[PDB]
């Protein structure tokens, strides 16, 4: 009945009174089947 | 009946009184089937 | 009956009293079938 894929990429700074966060070549596959 | 793919990319700064966050070549595939 | 793809790209600054956030070549494929 119900088939769900959820993919989230979170990127956040909280700078209060530089900053580097890199994602370098991500590859994502999601395989969900039924028989 | 119901087949859902959800993909979200979140990018956020909170600067209160530079900033770098890079995503570098993402590749996303979502494969959900039924038989 | 129901077949849904949802893709969202979020890009946001909150600057209160520079900023760089880059996405560099994203490739997205969404494959959902039925038999």
Numbering used by the authors:
A (entry chain B), B (entry chain A), C (entry chain C): 274 to 290, 304 to 321
Quote the original article:
The ordered assembly of tau protein into amyloid filaments defines a number of neurodegenerative diseases, also known as tauopathies; they are the most common proteinopathies of the human nervous system. The physiological function of tau is to promote the assembly, and possibly stability, of microtubules. Here, we used cryo-EM to determine the structures of heparin-induced filaments assembled from recombinant full-length 4R tau (2N4R, 441 amino acid isoform) and the corresponding 3R isoform (2N3R, 410 amino acid isoform) to resolutions sufficient for de novo atomic modelling. Our results show that heparin-induced 2N4R filaments consist of a mixture of at least four different conformations, whereas heparin-induced 2N3R filaments mainly adopt a single conformation.
At 3.5 Å, the overall resolution for the jagged filament structure was lower than for the other two 4R filament types and the side-chain densities were resolved less well than for snake and twister filaments. The helical twist of −2.03° for the jagged structure falls between those of the snake and twister filaments; the offset of the centre of the packing unit from the helical axis also lies in-between. The extent of the ordered core, comprising residues 274–321, is almost identical to that of twister filament. There are three β-strands, β1 (274–290), β2 (305–310) and β3 (313–321). Again, the structure is characterised by an overall kink, which, with an angle of 52° between β2 and β3, is the least pronounced of the three 4R tau filament structures. However, unlike in the snake and twister filaments, there is no inner corner of the kink. Instead, one long, slightly bent β-strand extends from residues 274–290. The K280 side-chain points towards the inside of the core and makes a salt bridge with D314, whereas the K281 side-chain points outwards, and forms a salt bridge with D283. The strand residues on the N-terminal side of K280 have also their orientations reversed, and form a new cross-β interface with the β3 strand of R3. The density of the whole arc was not good enough for model building, resulting in the omission of residues 291–303 from the atomic model, and ambiguity in how the strands on opposite sides of the core connected to each other.
